[PDB]
Symmetry: C3
């Protein structure tokens, strides 16, 4: 398309919402291609990632970890206004794996504190894609400090299964998984720092052991458990978007399954079906579609159970509805053996 053609396309401004929720959108595209505008501010701030008061200097898109999920349709243009406040201390940029050229946009979006930039790219490929900050020479540090998220480029005709059958979800949640590498003092206690830069050296040596100290969903251990559990009802169709910008993960819905899973996250690649545990390599986003059949609590985890229950990668789903005894029943409840 020529510049004049792109300029005459209708524009839509979107208000981003905090994860795990997603901004309003239509699954089946309404009309022709559009220019969809998003605005994100970068916040460098301290966040507590566990119940022991462990602090980390996060670098967050819109103040959250992960950054929000942006949704567009194939062949729409995504136009991002990215702002780095004058109160921040580092240069940041953004690389959209959904984009083509200039290191995903990272080469055209380097902004220092007090600057802003506007980048536009055509969403030519459908699927879920990771986006993350990637400043030359400090790439892994910004990513493992939480500066990453994901976008979803829906096919214009909505989601479909392997054989053309339409798949419409009632709800969608975005689970961003993050590996943190927090330094510990000579006593095995987590260290705290005044400013982001002061933690760099120590963090890098923890990073080189390739063993995270924490692995969490939505920025903190237990962030999506208890009162913050994700919800659904029996009969509802849910799409769960999962991203990991740096490290492998293996999602599994305990008590349920992955009816249709685009483990690689690309909609033109047929989904795998009836999955128990799927695999998302570091540097990618994946999506699973499931229709709940039983009520109760479900645990959604990284199925390396140590990472899930010892490091923090575990979330809850609270589902309402009626129990189905055909699918599962307790014939004899736990009781003492009668001698």
């Amino acid at each position: 398309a020529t510049a004049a053609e792109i300029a005459a396309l209708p524009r839509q401004k979107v208000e981003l919402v905090d994860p795990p929720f997603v901004h309003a959108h239509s699954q089946v595209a309404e009309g022709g291609p559009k220019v969809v505008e998003f605005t994100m501010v970068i916040e460098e701030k301290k966040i507590v990632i566990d119940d022991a008061g462990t602090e980390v200097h996060a670098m967050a898109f819109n103040g959250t970890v992960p950054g929000p999920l942006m949704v567009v349709h194939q062949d729409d243009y995504l136009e991002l206004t990215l702002i780095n406040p004058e109160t921040n201390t580092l240069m940041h940029n953004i690389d959209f794996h959904a984009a083509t050229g200039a290191l995903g946009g990272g080469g055209l979006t380097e902004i220092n504190p007090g600057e802003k930039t506007i980048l536009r790219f055509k969403a030519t490929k459908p699927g879920v894609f990771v986006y993350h900050c990637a400043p030359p020479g400090m790439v892994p540090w910004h990513v493992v400090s939480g500066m990453n998220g994901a976008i979803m480029v829906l096919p214009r005709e909505g989601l479909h299964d392997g054989k053309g059958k339409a798949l419409t979800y009632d709800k969608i949640y975005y689970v961003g998984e993050q590996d943190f590498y927090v330094p510990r003092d000579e006593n095995g206690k987590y260290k705290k720092y005044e400013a982001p830069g002061d933690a760099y050296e120590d963090t890098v040596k923890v990073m080189r052991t390739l063993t995270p100290t924490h692995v969490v969903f939505n920025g903190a251990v237990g962030a999506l458990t208890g009162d913050k559990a994700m919800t659904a009802a029996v009969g509802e169709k849910v799409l769960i978007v999962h991203s990991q910008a740096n490290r492998d993960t293996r999602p599994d819905l305990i008590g349920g399954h992955g009816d249709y899973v685009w483990a690689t996250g690309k909609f033109n690649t047929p989904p795998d079906v009836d999955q128990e545990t799927w695999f998302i390599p570091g540097g990618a986003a994946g999506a699973a579609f499931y229709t709940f059949q039983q009520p109760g609590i479900y645990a959604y985890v990284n199925h390396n159970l140590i990472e899930a229950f010892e490091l923090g990668a575990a979330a809850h789903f609270k589902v309402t509805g009626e129990w189905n005894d055909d699918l599962m029943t307790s014939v004899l409840a736990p009781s003492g053996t009668i001698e």
Copy 2:
């Protein structure tokens, strides 16, 4: 199905056998849905996992690591009687990834020493699935202490390749891969403990380094080598079921291939073909089908060669038959260069 309908279905009681063997079953289902009864006892006992006398307090279904493979057909009901002897010291339960609801059954099967429970669930999805103990608050510990296995839910019409061609195996073996995390004293020597609970704290800190001390097949280094090698003959079709309840693995049959591989372990997802090394994420089971064409010894390994040959993840297949020189021949046997 109503309760009265399930009650009128024919019942079949199955006697489980120790891995790597599998109980007798038919590939193509005989008739309509059935209620298939299995019984498993939980044994807490010390096992030696290597040739250095290294001991571990295993928590084993039917006394083996892995627990046995249970086989049913799609839409059959699996009814398990689970028993926790009064001589055990911990509460245990079971989560079937093949099941729908109540955390895979874990929420309905918590039994203390001296108790039993009976759980029934409909096997709605075909494929190989992991099952494991998962007590609230102590999930990874029971899993890495060996309390896991797998089940196979065969399609009613038997196995088929991507394009409807029937696949009938002559033999089937179940390889359970286990990651152990054994504590070491100040001298680098493995520690021993009186009771399961006494090893908990030390084991947990080894678990957090995410680096196992041992990675074995059938519960011990060399468990499936030498005289215990799995067997086959040239021309025979073999199905190899592989499970890993907590950690990723990458199976590879050295000297052979994976003609058809359901790496994700789900039969409704077409198999990948002609595989050299496949990948099974932690929290899943996979299956590979191969027709032997050459006699001799084959090594079946986790292809991270350090885990295979240094940590213990290596097994043997001894195959009888005649050598095929068309496929491979030594034109010039190793000999001194003639100067």
Copy 3:
């Protein structure tokens, strides 16, 4: 085929070239099956793997790490002459994952210094396959010392996408990824040794931590960056072969995508499409096909960004051509926020 039939087949001798380049070949097979002869010498030599002067005693096929890529077509016979010079100190052999029988050929090719052997095998399965040295009792050590490479068995009719469409590449590059485990003294400085064998013990204990000290492409940090960047032009179709004989990797072309990816590396398994990051398990080779649409520098990395930018797994592609503003444009270049 009988011996007389194989003996009457035409023969072709191939001169191997150093990675990342590949020897001349035709994508679509010219005529019938052939016997393709390759010759490789084994070199035990010291190589420097980073800019800090870190040395390693490599064991290299044809003196390079990885060894060269050999190309044949399905049903051709590959006949390898393998030579172990009298000046080497260890016995070596070779296991072709592309081969059937005798541990991939390893059981028929054990040669001591001063010996040679000739092995022939029929390339029955199409795809990219790893090959590596595997001497009994010292398998992982030879592999992580660099003795591995890959071969490509092209379908006789050339590459095709999932639905029969022909895929013809203009260029092909072979990226061999290697994990090294270099011992460090009491001061955290890399140790040096006189002979291969003298480093064995120390290396093995680093290997058991399963954490490499370096992860590189083409044998050294930065080996494929700067002036040694791989090249292409906008509009050109490139096939990138990637292998990892021992450890998992997750390739990603920063700024681009994987239009068609045989992540498992087997051509009879349909490719995944529009990939951002794909996964190649240790013990396998994979291939990605991409058509460049934008000029500039691209980074090709293992997308665990710590392994890429801290450990060495990063390469460059320099692409010439004209920028396409439809795909991506800087609407507002980084500039100060106007207050």
